[PDB]
Amino acid sequence: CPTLIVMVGLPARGKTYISKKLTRYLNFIGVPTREFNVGQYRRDMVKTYKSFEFFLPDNEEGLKIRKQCALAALNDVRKFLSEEGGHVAVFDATNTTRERRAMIFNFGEQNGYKTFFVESICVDPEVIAANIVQVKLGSPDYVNRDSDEATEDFMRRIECYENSYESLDEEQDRDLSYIKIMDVGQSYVVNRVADHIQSRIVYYLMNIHVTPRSIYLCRHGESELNLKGRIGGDPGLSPRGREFSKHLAQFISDQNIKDLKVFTSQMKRTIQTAEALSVPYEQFKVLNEIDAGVCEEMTYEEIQDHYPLEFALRDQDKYRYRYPKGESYEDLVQRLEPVIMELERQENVLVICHQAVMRCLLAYFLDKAAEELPYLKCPLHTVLKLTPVAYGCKVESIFLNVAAVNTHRDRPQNVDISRPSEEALVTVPAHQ
Amino acid sequence: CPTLIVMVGLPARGKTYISKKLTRYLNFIGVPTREFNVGQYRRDMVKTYKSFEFFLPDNEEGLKIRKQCALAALNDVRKFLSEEGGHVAVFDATNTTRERRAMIFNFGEQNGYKTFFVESICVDPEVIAANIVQVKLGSPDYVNRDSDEATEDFMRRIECYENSYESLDEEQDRDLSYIKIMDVGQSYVVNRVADHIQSRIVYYLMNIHVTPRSIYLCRHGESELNLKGRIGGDPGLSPRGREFSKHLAQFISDQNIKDLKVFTSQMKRTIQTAEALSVPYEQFKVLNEIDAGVCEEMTYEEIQDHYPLEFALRDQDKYRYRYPKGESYEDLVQRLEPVIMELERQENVLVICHQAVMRCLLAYFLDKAAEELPYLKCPLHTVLKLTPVAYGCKVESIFLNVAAVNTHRDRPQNVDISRPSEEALVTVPAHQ
């Protein structure tokens, strides 16, 4: 049974924001998910937005056209789940009345899906006001329009929905599966989680927030094996690694971060990097570097020499293929799910980790495809500062002024099984 | 900051039940937790229970004595968290008024703990009635008393709490961290989860239920390596293993289980066992057998020959020590946390697994200590049927009538590092 997530709420309540975070998350953990924004369908269908009168609850023609856009969206939901193999579909619209919601419920039923509602509630004017400026004035409907007329139009637009707005009821809607998010995620009301995926969705939603903050990611300072061009193992810091550690501490101090939380793996290179700071930290083995199995501590030359077959396959699909007895980046993604969850729950946080692990975390907050994730560039002695924003995440690369070996290997042009060794190792960085 | 979980609710609302499940769970995942039942303190203090008049809200002396018992309980909470290194304490009492709750809140504050409330609400008479019979009439307060007078006394006892019962309020109690469970876990209200442990507590509580059902655990049918007395690896079924598979299918059919869910690991021996059934199943690598690392596929004789040091330590503490590159039963417990969670969420379920994995699952539902867990007996070709009940779990061992090698190794009397090999292998079962 695929899952149909139905967003519910007045305009400017963070529905699209939640829809996006949920869709990205579900896709990260490998559940084919796609969001369907009725507003975008309308925009593609209506061409240009004039004013709120289109949304008047007593505007029969408008309602008609509005119903048509919803249906167009629902039809693609059906195609995705029923014809393209999608697992979850997020239907993003106001869906503020019992009527529409029952209609959508019926759709799910006739199509064989399980329906779950996510209602976002906000009665706070400064937040609503903040949301308008922050996301609405810049949106397509209002770009190239005067801020004040745009703002008035939108408020009048929200008004169109108030008289008919029927929130999920404990008794009237007791048979529906749903979650109601209030106070921007302060409190929640949950009813009838029907299964495992809904339980994980609720778990996810209850742990996300919009409290301003930055996520800092950096690798342990250069290690002894990094110098040798050797992967994995449990090396200690190299002289430069130690230098970096001191540059990181100064950076962290200079940052003057409010209540920063610092995490490291259980590998000495990250811990030794963490020892350099003023602030305390927590070590978690879940943050340990990807396991290379039989090629642990080997150099790429050695790997090509002993595992030419596995090395070629891994290059062909570096997300899915692994070395014998090792993890794939896919296994690592699965392994990092708890990390992703706690990072969402966290506020200001610094994670001192490793190349593969950092690529996984960057891919998550930067919404990078699985195919692209194994190749993201995570240079040594550089801090990547992430500032989650509406629908996206800004990133800043901050070099901490300490030389370091390059551990980034590009995918060689030749990835054919039985490829000459020279072509296999052509993209290997300098070392020793 | 240790955590103080405060139970809240009218008598017979499953508070003690929830308190117990929560405490057991938290301890299973390694968080030192202890529950403090004020009713038990009262029982140890008051000696014998006469009647409900003791609980009259206008009974000043009773209130006084009732306050004394609460305080005695709170003092042990303080000792556990503040002096014995406990992490979480569950204070189990009605705590139905704002007054008492504020008092407890203050206690937590002065002691440096984070307070989290768990309120259980039930307005269903048949359930309340069921609870009385099911747990109350047999309890100490009522054992050896006539069912009818016992029952009347208890109802009048619940009455004592109704006029003063003040449930957690969205506005009045908006600054408190809490969860309200309704309809026996149908719906929930959650407010201000303050941290990681509270997030996991909520996640746990929202996934437990009291829907009648049985958990069936059995190992894959005897495997080729089981015959040889070889551990781990990925062997296929032995001839007897196949025989068992057919006996299991018949057993499952004969059981006539409503909507049974079947789980196996990604190891062929369990899958091959699962192939024998009518019903479909899901394979999860999280259910794979404990990893023996460098001793994979070896025999104990071989292990003693190549790893006399690691083998002795493992025998000294089989929960914590591991073979080089392998998992400890502790690592396995951590690994199985998602399995425990989904098992709680499940109803009728059959899990076809392995020796170490099954020991971990048995220890959880049977509340066996960590020290005892690595040694639980999980014979081949036998199904262990678990029927969760109030405060406990009944277990029935059902042999499926197929011969099998014994893979159970008792802890030898000699576990000294440098112990003679004959004494180390003295408890090794017959094989080959």
Ligand SMILES: Nc1ncnc2c1ncn2[C@@H]1O[C@H](COP(=O)(O)OP(=O)(O)OP(O)(O)=S)[C@@H](O)[C@H]1O
């Ligand atoms: N739970 C929340 N409560 C209130 N605002 C939120 C919440 N989550 C996100 N936001 C903010 O809402 C903004 C994003 O709003 P959108 O997702 O466009 O709202 P919207 O409800 O989809 O309005 P429509 O699509 O026009 S009906 C960003 O400023 C978010 O930080």
Ligand SMILES: Nc1ncnc2c1ncn2[C@@H]1O[C@H](COP(=O)(O)OP(=O)(O)OP(O)(O)=S)[C@@H](O)[C@H]1O
């Ligand atoms: N969420 C729940 N709703 C209602 N009953 C429950 C719930 N969870 C468990 N039970 C049932 O409640 C019984 C256990 O009740 P207890 O835990 O003794 O109640 P109690 O609320 O602790 O009463 P006291 O301690 O006398 S104040 C068992 O029958 C459970 O199956």
Ligand SMILES: [Mg+2]
């Ligand atoms: Mg929207």
Ligand SMILES: [Mg+2]
């Ligand atoms: Mg109780």
